[PDB]
Write a protein that holds these residues in place. Structure first.
Motif, PDB file in Angstrom:
ATOM      1  N   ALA D 117       0.988   0.770  10.472  1.00 22.51           N
ATOM      2  CA  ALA D 117      -0.357   1.705  10.788  1.00 22.51           C
ATOM      3  C   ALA D 117      -0.212   2.569  11.885  1.00 22.51           C
ATOM      4  O   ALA D 117      -0.497   2.227  13.195  1.00 22.51           O
ATOM      5  N   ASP D 118       0.236   3.918  11.834  1.00 20.76           N
ATOM      6  CA  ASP D 118      -0.182   4.836  12.766  1.00 20.76           C
ATOM      7  C   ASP D 118      -1.468   5.589  12.363  1.00 20.76           C
ATOM      8  O   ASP D 118      -2.143   4.973  11.737  1.00 20.76           O
ATOM      9  N   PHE D 119      -1.779   6.412  13.294  1.00 21.44           N
ATOM     10  CA  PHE D 119      -3.019   7.172  12.732  1.00 21.44           C
ATOM     11  C   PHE D 119      -2.764   8.664  12.623  1.00 21.44           C
ATOM     12  O   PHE D 119      -2.560   9.439  13.402  1.00 21.44           O
ATOM     13  N   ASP D 120      -2.099   8.949  11.357  1.00 24.14           N
ATOM     14  CA  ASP D 120      -2.009  10.323  10.758  1.00 24.14           C
ATOM     15  C   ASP D 120      -3.029  10.552   9.975  1.00 24.14           C
ATOM     16  O   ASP D 120      -3.349  11.678   9.055  1.00 24.14           O
ATOM     17  N   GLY D 121      -4.146   9.915   9.712  1.00 21.96           N
ATOM     18  CA  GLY D 121      -5.103   9.675   8.759  1.00 21.96           C
ATOM     19  C   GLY D 121      -5.199   8.784   7.664  1.00 21.96           C
ATOM     20  O   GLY D 121      -5.377   8.779   6.655  1.00 21.96           O
ATOM     21  N   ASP D 122      -4.222   7.627   8.065  1.00 18.07           N
ATOM     22  CA  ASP D 122      -4.306   6.330   7.379  1.00 18.07           C
ATOM     23  C   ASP D 122      -5.655   6.066   7.035  1.00 18.07           C
ATOM     24  O   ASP D 122      -6.544   6.245   7.886  1.00 18.07           O
ATOM     25  N   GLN D 123      -5.736   5.107   6.070  1.00 19.86           N
ATOM     26  CA  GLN D 123      -7.157   4.594   5.739  1.00 19.86           C
ATOM     27  C   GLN D 123      -6.952   3.200   5.370  1.00 19.86           C
ATOM     28  O   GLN D 123      -5.999   2.697   4.714  1.00 19.86           O
TER      29      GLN D 123
HETATM   30 MG   LIG Z   1       0.257   6.737   8.517  1.00 24.81          MG
END
Ligand SMILES: [Mg+2]
Ligand SMILES: [Zn+2]
Ligand SMILES: [Zn+2]
Lengths: 14, 1112, 94, 170, 99, 111, 221, 147
Positions: D117-123
């Motif tokens: 999990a990166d934060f690209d807009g992951d939920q």
């Molecule tokens: Mg991501």
DNA sequence: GCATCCGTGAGTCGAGGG
RNA sequence: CCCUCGA
DNA sequence: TATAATCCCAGGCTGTCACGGATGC
């Protein structure tokens, strides 16, 4: 195979 | 502010109208502006010409048609959920072969959906776009037999539908085989049926060594065409009596019938060019004077034999070549569905002609337009290429309309599409955009059309090129197909030119896509521009040549995702297309002719032109789009202003003074900050919320119906049983929420009451009834409320009543009320941000202004990006954009930098220098010297090799500024960052993905009918799915009770879940789980299959999980 | 990390055995109103309220701590189930 | 599909200890809702359960003491966080939640590697284990801090990365 | 009608756990209120509203069950209803269930 | 008792009939006005079960005091409606027919 | 102290190749046919490319993306298969009592076939670490008893002993030889690699194995 | 897996391959009821063989048989496992014909049934463990001693 | 003993829209 | 279920 | 409940692959 054609044959026998 | 533009490349021609593919296609299809006798044979005209006349009244013939005026305008269509269309009137005449009686009447064929000015449609109130489809161009192709090296497969492909795919092969035994509808038979037979004799075939095909011997069968030439025809019919049709006229009918229909077999016009031309022949008709053969006559087949087999033997001048064909692939536009697809509907109508006509009175009949009695109506309706409703429009910004619509899909009806089925079809072919150059395409499963299938690219009348794509004669580049622009292009040598657009002449003795060019170094004399043509090679979106990315392809793609795709901002600004750095895009998207209002502006108002703009006429342009204001984004046009002009032709009257949504404005221009510093920007996350200054940066208006449409029931009618009322005035406060007399009222989750938009179902009061209900001495009311509260997590201010209400003028609803329904609730969304935590370079992320922190890293003059940066993103993502464009953005911040100017003709480093260095002279010298004139901290950071810079030792602090600081880095002070300390930080102006957009929409939670709620497992989706208040893989997780952990809990008490076990909620709300531990209901569903569904499923104990004695309920 | 997890994991021959012992004890405490605790008043886990320190509502925490004390005995076939149940209900009524 | 499971966008709390995660207030309210009702009856925030539920039904009827009560509810308990796709058992981990204003879920920086999990807009999705057995299972076994090493390789899965390595190196 | 193939369609028949819990708490609270009365008047109310065998008896049948006149048993019903009204005005527990 | 096993076997017509609470005679769903199960139709309550908890079709016995009691007039048992998810129906064929799974699943078992 | 060099060397971000693309030439590229172009990109993203170079790079990129997608699908499938075939494997006891074992080779035949050479460290670790010895092993004056779970240090020690030519293979209890029914025993299995200790009885190693094979599957190029 | 720079412990692969080697083919029935070419589990045929040798009968001559993970998963003794994987029809028919019984040995079975899995906290090894404080233990010890 | 047609597979979660 | 968009 | 009728629902309309199993020189 095909019911329609088969029935057409069976009817074509008479 | 002044805008400086770079680059030495002069674009000869402007960009063609963008939506023109849509518009031209549909107009060319309808020909509504053409008098009915001047129409050509294409379009719905083609449809009529193919379908009619209808024989066996004996004859029904087609004269002409017309298109009428729309019963409703566009805005009204959207309002009332109708379709925007024109009535189709056609003139037919009834003719008896015997009587000679002629009856002629104009018949109403139903309505044909009309395309709006921007290239879209309106279907049932929802804007929609028809996406052009790509496929294999009809024609005759030859590809190597994969199994047999040295041999080949001839393939004759018609239009989609319109005929069978025909394969020709040389079999291992040596005979020539023809495959049709998956049936292998010797071609020789059909050749005889065409009337060929061994003599003609021996003189024609004899040249190729022992090829023709595989074509020689004596038994075939021993029979006249009739016998061979009956023979082939027996081959293709087992069980069917081989009656002569039946065989002629079937075969003619299969090959020579232009009605049921049609090559493309492109198919025709390509067949001609490939085989070196001329086609009279569009079929593979003809019926002339009682016999069949060859067109295609023999030259095809000749070419195939020539290719097989190795006969010179014969080559295979690339089926992914852009010359062998064509584009089916909206007009062509609409034409096809129209045709099918018309044929259905023809069946209806004949079936009506066999029935009824043979004397009295009219075109009215014969023709039922219903199947045509249904066909068209299905094409514009449930089809694949008809998609819900993407309105999010103007660019989204423009690109949507510029899309190309390889999927859909007649196209590739998914998972049957490999690499070859998804690849970028060398001929995509200037035609299909190599950048823009979706991420994931759809990659390569959905593409976009190049900027200067054009689709011609034959469905092929053309890209412009300049004529080069004797080393002289003219302004002559020759639009070429892929093959025509393959014929020549074409130099690059950046080729050095003094005047119109080639300056370089060595120039970069392409021969059949292959890059090659050539002399000016050898240059035949030249590229128009870099812009031609990429899409609309990809042309919006500055310093593209510095960006890796992937992040560029994300740049485009996310540009189309951008939410229009109230304050939105055009990028500080522009590629020059930010204007045209606004123009062609019809987002911004323009002055029609020269003249003076009479009036300026929010709702209105009035202009008097050179003619003297007074023209009033109404302004679209606070209109909700497909995706929920607000569309409103702001007047850009003042009363009494003098405007020329094409000057901007008003800015639409997401536009600044005629320039495309998606996101915002902020001040960024790229540094790690306290692990908040860790992994693509972003940190923002609270000041952005203060000045209303990154804030947008969002409208949400709600709808409720009052219908007639058998228990009595539902009705919209202000009388709701068991509700306080506190609940009814914002409701009006009728029960409708008032305009301008703030609504929160739980609030009632429309009060409604429905008569209760049959109610047998439980003893508790009766006892309570008697206790409180109150009679249970007839109705109950069904009222539409606000979905949790939603709300806003009410802008509008639309009420439709049955028995009122111009209003008729669906059967059983009394009245329909629509509430429009809008909102103003401040940027917040979880919202997604992105740039044109592909850098994207969620806001993880919002810092008060005092914590923001700031400049020495006390100017806090707006946004903090983490540097760790940049290296692996390999998009350097954002950096250059940031430097030039800094220079722009100080010099107070924006820039236009074309792609691949750029603003190079040295020029940005000079600009940056000037920016320093503004940034520093002011301070020295203000009576301030260099700060201690700046000296420290300067020491650190010397150690970093970022400055030259021995130069004065000012000189070193400037040396840092030309490197686009500056001293930055941490706001929490006041101590500087230990090194100089890169700071500048960057164009950053808010995307459509916002945490307000995406936050959801559930405790209990609605369940599915059969399975009794919870529903899913936010709107339905659904639970999250715990998948197979998650069960794998819990299993790997070895947590049994958590898993079991997920499998029973949480989802389908009704006893379990009711008892669970009851246990918890009583402060008791949850009960042991029982059998999941879906298992019972499984058992009973196995029994319906006559399979006996038995739950047994260790003694193999049955155990009833149904507890005796299913057993007698 | 739950405190002394290394010790608890060192106690048993399987981590899952620990999990069972803990959950069972937690249900015991929840059932008898904590009255059966082996914890002295100073050994009592505390929740920090708006007012002040109260007892810890989470029975699992209690269970793990008690298990840390070494005052509990775990194993298989120590006592018939019903007998245990009624001995506990006798000592600590609910 | 299960009851007691929400979802939202994830954001990185750096401030979290390894065993914790940010859980938005609203979400935590809806997920623990029965426990919140019971705790509401235990206190004077409502005469009974139904009155409390009706109390929570509307947003403007919500006062502050209910948030404190909610804080009293979740004490010691952990939830489950999951990101799709779930490739290995570390695709789901246990976290003792911490209530936060806002709509976003705050995740610990390290465990990201195991979630990919990166934060690209992951939920991510949340799940509330109900029983005491479920809880003990989660805390002893499924706890993030309790698995520091890859069940596959036998190397630490939770290790410094990106910014952290950058700083320590610097 | 049209084909289910349906997943957007809720189940409107079966009670949600909220409803189940509500009915449970209602029965319990009603038993609480009926416990504050004498067993005879409580049983009379139960037989009159049908909390016992499921159906509501007439006055003659309850009177014949307890061995009194219809007027008598009706008056007992009245005084029980009155006492329940007093206890309700005092405690105000059941009000919430009136929707 | 505890369930330690699950068996799956072939169902005899006798078995099938012994499951069934009735034979559906008619190809009728529900009444086009009253919107109620047709007699000997696919949804018929005479067979599968009551639509409302402890209530018959005509409404003669509306309470739990009648349990297992079959209404005489409309022929509907008074019981929990949930059985409509459970109780099996059946259809008796004039001429017997072949289960296609044992025909077309290769190699054919019957074959 | 240059940021690229720092992030790359520390392992924070970036790799030699991407960095080389940022600084030196972009490098050679592939034709759509899998064939390679004869003319490389001399540009860096620092410098910026020609539309031509960019075009070639688009060939490559497209191919890459496609590959990634299709691969993800197939990998998902494989993982599901694996979970389904291994799901009943759970550690059901301490010892199956098997006398059987497997011998993990420390040496592999050279490609020159000149002689045997030492296997790479990681390989040996992956085949050795956290396993139970089925036989007594005496090396370097160190006594490794039957029933010893090899620690990481034990393994390094064994590699050392191998370099000294004392032992070419290590006997170890393995699920290949484990006679436990409907699963494996404690000894034969190994460490629980998450906890670096002997695996708790009841741990499901089937799902663990399946997932363990699964997750990197999407990464395999 | 190495080539791509992924560290993966051999023992997992060994588990799977172990499931791949699970089956054998008969090269002669001997004194058993088995048929030549009949395919079954190695475990079962070895059990039967030891039962025949203990009985003094002729052992079953058999061959090692390697099948892929898909076929092996479809070949498992549990029909609930096989039906829930793929080729559902084939599985259900053949299982019904044989009137096969699922012993609920594996995880998937119990998952479908909604039961408690036989792993971790649900393992029969650790799930029968009891928790007693010394006070209760001594009360019970007195109640035991007095009788 | 070796080709050929038929059947069954081909990632997860979420969102929106028809 | 199809499309499209997210991870 | 009465001229005479006597073999078709058309839909045609295509770019995946791998395995197992029955079928055909
Ligand atoms: Mg991501
Ligand atoms: Zn009745
Ligand atoms: Zn073993």
């Amino acid at each position: 195979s095909d019911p329609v054609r088969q029935y057409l044959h069976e009817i074509g026998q008479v | 502010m002044e805008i400086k533009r770079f680059g030495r490349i002069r674009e000869v021609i402007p960009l063609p109208p963008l939506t023109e593919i849509q518009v031209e296609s549909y107009r060319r299809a309808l020909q509504a502006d053409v008098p009915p006798e001047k129409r050509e044979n294409v379009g719905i005209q083609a449809a009529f010409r193919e379908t009619f006349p209808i024989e066996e009244g004996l004859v029904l013939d087609f004269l002409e048609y017309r298109l009428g005026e729309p019963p409703f305008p566009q805005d009204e269509c959207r309002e009332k959920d109708l379709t925007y269309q024109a009535p189709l009137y056609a003139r037919l005449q009834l003719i008896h072969k015997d009587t000679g009686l002629i009856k002629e009447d104009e018949v109403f064929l139903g309505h044909i959906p009309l395309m709006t000015e921007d290239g879209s449609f309106i279907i049932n109130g929802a804007d929609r776009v028809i996406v052009s489809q790509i496929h294999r161009s009809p024609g005759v192709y030859f590809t190597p037999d994969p199994a047999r090296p040295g041999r080949y497969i001839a393939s004759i492909i018609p239009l989609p539908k319109r005929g069978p795919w025909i394969d020709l092969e040389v079999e291992p035994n040596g005979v020539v085989s023809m495959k049709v509808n998956k049936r292998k038979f010797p071609l020789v037979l059909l050749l005889r049926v065409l009337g060929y004799d061994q003599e003609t075939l021996a003189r024609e095909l004899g040249a190729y060594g022992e090829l023709v011997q595989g074509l020689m069968d004596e038994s075939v030439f021993a029979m006249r065409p009739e016998e061979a025809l009956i023979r082939l019919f027996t081959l293709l049709r087992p069980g069917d009596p081989p009656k002569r006229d039946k065989a002629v009918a079937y075969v003619y229909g299969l090959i020579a019938d232009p009605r049921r077999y049609d090559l493309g016009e492109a198919g025709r031309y390509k067949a001609e060019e490939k085989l070196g022949i001329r086609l009279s008709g569009r079929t593979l053969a003809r019926f002339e004077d009682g016999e069949f006559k060859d067109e295609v087949f023999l030259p095809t087999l000749r070419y195939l034999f020539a290719l097989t033997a190795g006969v010179p001048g014969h080559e295979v064909d690339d089926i992914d070549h852009l010359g062998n692939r064509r584009i089916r536009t909206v007009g062509e697809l609409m034409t096809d569905q129209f045709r099918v509907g018309l044929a259905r109508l023809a069946r209806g006509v004949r079936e009506r002609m066999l029935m009824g009175s043979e004397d009295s009949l009219t075109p009215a009695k014969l023709v039922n337009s219903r199947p045509l109506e249904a066909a068209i309706r299905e094409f514009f409703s449930r089809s694949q290429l008809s998609q819900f429009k993407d309105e999010t910004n103007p660019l989204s619509s423009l690109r949507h309309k510029r899309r190309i899909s390889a999927l859909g009806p007649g196209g590739l089925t998914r998972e049957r599409a490999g690499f070859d079809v998804r690849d970028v072919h060398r001929t995509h150059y200037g035609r299909i955009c190599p950048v823009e395409t979706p991420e994931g499963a759809n990659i390569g299938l959905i593409t976009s059309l190049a900027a200067y690219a054009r689709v011609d009348e034959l469905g092929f794509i053309r890209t412009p090129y300049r004529r080069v004669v004797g080393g002289v580049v003219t302004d002559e622009v020759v639009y070429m197909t892929a093959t025509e292009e393959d014929r020549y040598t074409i130099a690059q657009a950046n080729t050095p030119l003094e005047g119109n002449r080639i300056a370089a003795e060595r120039v970069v060019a392409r021969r059949k896509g292959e890059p090659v170094i050539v002399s000016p004399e050898e240059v035949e043509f030249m590229d128009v521009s870099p812009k031609q090679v990429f899409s609309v979106n990809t042309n919006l990315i500055p310093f593209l040549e510095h960006d890796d392809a992937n992040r560029a793609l994300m740049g485009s795709n996310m540009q189309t995702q951008a939410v229009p901002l109230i304050r939105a600004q055009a990028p500080v750095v522009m590629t020059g297309l930010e204007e045209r895009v606004v123009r062609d998207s019809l987002a911004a209002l323009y002055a029609e002719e020269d003249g003076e502006v009479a009036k300026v108002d929010g709702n209105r703009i009035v202009v008097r032109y050179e003619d003297g006429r007074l023209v009033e342009y109404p302004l679209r204001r606070f209109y909700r789009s497909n995706q929920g984004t607000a569309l409103d046009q702001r007047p850009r002009v003042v009363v009494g202003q003098r405007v020329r032709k094409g000057d901007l009257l008003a800015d639409g949504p997401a536009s600044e003074n005629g320039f495309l404005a998606l996101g915002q221009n902020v001040l960024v510093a790229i540094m790690p900050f306290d692990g908040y920007n860790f992994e693509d996350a972003i940190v923002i200054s609270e000041e952005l919320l203060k000045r209303d940066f990154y804030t947008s208006i969002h409208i949400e449409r709600y709808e409720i119906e009052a219908r007639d029931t058998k228990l009595g009618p539902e009705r919209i009322t202000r009388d709701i049983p068991h509700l306080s005035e506190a609940a009814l406060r914002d409701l009006d007399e009728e029960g409708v929420v008032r305009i301008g009222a703030e609504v929160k989750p739980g609030d009632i938009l429309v009060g409604r009451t429905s008569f209760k179902g049959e109610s047998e009061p439980t003893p508790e209900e009766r006892l309570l009834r008697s206790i409180f001495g109150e009679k249970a009311r007839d109705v109950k509260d069904t009222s539409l409320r606000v979905p949790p997590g939603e709300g806003g201010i009410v802008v509008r209400t639309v009420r439709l009543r049955r028995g009122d003028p111009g209003v008729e609803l669906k059967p059983g329904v009394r009245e329909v009320v629509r509430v429009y609730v809008a909102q103003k969304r401040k940027l917040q935590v979880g919202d997604k941000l992105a740039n044109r370079h592909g850098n994207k992320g969620v806001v993880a922190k919002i810092l008060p202004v005092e914590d923001m890293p700031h400049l020495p003059d006390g100017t806090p940066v707006d946004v903090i990006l983490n540097p760790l993103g940049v290296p692996s993502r390999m998009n350097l464009g954002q950096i250059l954009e940031t430097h030039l953005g800094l220079a722009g911040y100080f010099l107070g100017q924006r820039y236009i930098s074309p792609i691949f003709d750029g603003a190079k480093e040295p020029e940005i260095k000079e600009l940056l220098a000037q920016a320093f002279e503004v940034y520093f010298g002011k301070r020295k004139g203000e009576g301030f010297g260099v700060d201690k901290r700046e000296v420290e950071v300067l020491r650190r810079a010397e150690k970093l090799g970022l400055v030259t030792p021995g130069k004065t602090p000012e000189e070193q600081l400037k040396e840092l500024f030309l490197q686009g880095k500056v001293v930055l002070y941490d706001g929490r300390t006041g101590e500087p960052i230990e090194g100089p930080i890169v700071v500048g102006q960057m164009f950053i957009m808010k995307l459509y993905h916002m945490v307000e929409d995406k936050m959801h939670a559930r405790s209990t709620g609605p369940y599915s009918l059969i399975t009794q497992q919870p529903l899913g989706g936010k709107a339905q208040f659904g639970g999250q799915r715990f998948g197979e893989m998650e069960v794998w997780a819990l299993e790997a952990y070895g947590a049994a009770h958590t898993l079991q809990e997920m499998l029973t008490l949480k989802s389908d076990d009704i006893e379990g879940r009711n008892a669970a909620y009851e246990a918890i709300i009583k402060g008791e531990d949850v009960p042991e789980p029982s059998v999941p209901e879906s298992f019972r569903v499984l058992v009973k569904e196995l029994q319906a299959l006559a399979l006996d499923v038995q739950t047994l104990d260790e003694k193999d004695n049955p155990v009833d999980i149904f507890e005796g309920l299913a057993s007698k | 990390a739950e405190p002394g997890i290394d010790k608890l994991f060192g106690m048993v021959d399987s981590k899952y055995r620990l999990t069972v012992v803990v959950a069972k004890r937690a249900q015991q405490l929840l059932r008898h109103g904590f009255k059966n605790t082996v914890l002295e008043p100073e050994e009592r886990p505390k929740m920090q309220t708006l007012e002040g320190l109260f007892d810890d509502p989470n029975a699992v925490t209690w269970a793990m701590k008690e298990l840390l004390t070494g005052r509990l005995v775990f194993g298989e076939n120590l006592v018939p189930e019903d007998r245990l149940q009624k001995e506990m209900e006798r000592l600590y009524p609910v | 599909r299960v009851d007691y499971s929400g979802r939202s966008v994830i954001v990185v709390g750096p401030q979290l200890k390894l065993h914790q995660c940010g859980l938005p207030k609203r979400m935590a309210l809806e997920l623990f809702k029965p426990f919140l009702l019971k705790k509401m009856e235990e206190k004077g925030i409502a005469p009974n359960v139904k009155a409390a539920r009706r109390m929570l039904e509307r947003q403007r009827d919500i006062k502050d003491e209910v948030w404190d009560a909610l804080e009293e509810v979740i004490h010691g308990k952990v939830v489950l966080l999951n990101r799709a796709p779930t490739l290995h058992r570390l695709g789901i981990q246990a976290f003792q939640p911490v209530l936060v204003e806002g709509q976003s879920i705050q995740l610990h920086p390290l465990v990201c590697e195991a979630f990919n999990a990166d934060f690209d807009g992951d939920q991510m999705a949340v799940h509330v284990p109900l029983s005491s057995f479920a809880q003990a299972e989660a805390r002893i076994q499924m706890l993030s801090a309790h698995n520091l090493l890859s069940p596959a390789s036998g190397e630490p899965l939770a290790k410094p990365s990106r910014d952290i390595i950058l700083g320590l190196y610097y | 009608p049209v084909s289910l193939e349906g997943d957007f369609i809720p189940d409107e028949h079966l009670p949600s756990p909220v409803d189940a819990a509500t009915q449970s708490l209602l029965s319990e609270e009603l038993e609480k209120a009926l416990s504050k009365l004498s067993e005879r008047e409580a049983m009379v109310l139960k037989l009159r509203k049908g909390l016992i065998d499921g159906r509501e008896h007439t006055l003659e049948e309850v009177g014949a069950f307890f061995g009194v006149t219809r007027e008598r048993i009706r008056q007992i019903e009245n005084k029980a209803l009155r006492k329940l009204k007093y206890h309700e005005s005092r405690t105000r527990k059941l009000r919430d269930f009136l929707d | 008792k505890e369930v330690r096993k699950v068996r799956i076997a072939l169902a005899s017509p006798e078995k099938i009939r012994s499951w069934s609470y009735g034979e559906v005679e008619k190809p009728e769903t529900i009444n086009y006005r009253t919107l109620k199960p047709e007699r000997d139709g696919l949804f018929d309550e005479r067979i599968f079960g009551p639509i409302k908890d402890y209530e018959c079709a005509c409404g003669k016995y509306k309470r739990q005091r009648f349990e297992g009691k079959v209404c005489e007039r409309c022929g509907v048992e008074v019981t929990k409606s949930i059985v409509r998810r459970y109780r099996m129906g059946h259809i008796e064929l004039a001429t017997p027919a072949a289960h296609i799974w044992f025909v077309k699943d290769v190699p054919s078992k019957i074959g | 102290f240059n940021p690229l060099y720092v992030m790359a060397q520390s392992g924070a971000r970036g790799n030699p190749q991407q960095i080389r693309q940022l600084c030196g030439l972009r490098g050679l590229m592939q034709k759509p046919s899998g064939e390679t172009f004869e003319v490389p990109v001399r540009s860096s993203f620092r410098e910026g490319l020609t539309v031509l170079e960019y075009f070639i790079s688009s060939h490559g990129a497209r191919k890459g993306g496609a590959d990634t997608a299709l691969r993800t699908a197939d990998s998902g499938y494989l993982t599901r298969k694996l979970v389904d075939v291994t799901h009943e494997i759970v550690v059901r006891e301490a010892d199956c009592g098997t006398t059987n074992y497997i011998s993990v080779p420390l040496f592999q035949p050279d490609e020159v076939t000149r002689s045997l050479r030492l296997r790479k460290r990681a390989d040996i670790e992956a085949g050795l670490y956290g396993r139970v010895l089925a036989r007594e092993v005496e090396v370097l004056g160190v006594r490794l008893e039957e029933g010893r779970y090899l620690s990481m240090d034990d393994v390094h020690l064994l590699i050392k002993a191998a370099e000294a030519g004392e032992i070419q293979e290590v006997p170890v209890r393995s699920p290949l030889t484990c006679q436990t029914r409907y699963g494996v025993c404690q000894k034969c299995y190994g460490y629980d690699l998450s906890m670096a200790r002997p695996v708790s009885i009841g741990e499901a190693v089937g799902i663990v194995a399946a997932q363990s094979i699964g997750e990197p599957g999407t990464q395999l190029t | 897996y190495r080539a791509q720079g992924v560290k993966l412990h051999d023992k997992h692969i060994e588990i799977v391959v172990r499931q791949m080697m699970k089956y054998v083919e008969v090269t002669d029935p001997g004194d058993s009821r088995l048929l030549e070419g009949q395919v079954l589990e190695k475990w079962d045929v070895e059990a039967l063989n030891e039962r025949l040798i203990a009985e003094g009968k002729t052992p079953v001559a058999w061959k090692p048989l390697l099948m892929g993970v898909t076929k092996s998963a479809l070949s498992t003794k549990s029909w609930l496992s096989a039906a829930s994987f793929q080729n559902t029809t084939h599985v259900l028919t053949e299982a019904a014909i044989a009137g096969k019984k699922d012993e609920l040995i594996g995880l998937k079975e119990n998952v479908i049934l909604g039961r408690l899995i036989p792993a971790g906290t649900g393992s029969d090894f650790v799930r029968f463990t009891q928790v007693v404080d010394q006070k209760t233990l001594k009360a019970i010890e007195e109640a035991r001693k007095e009788a």
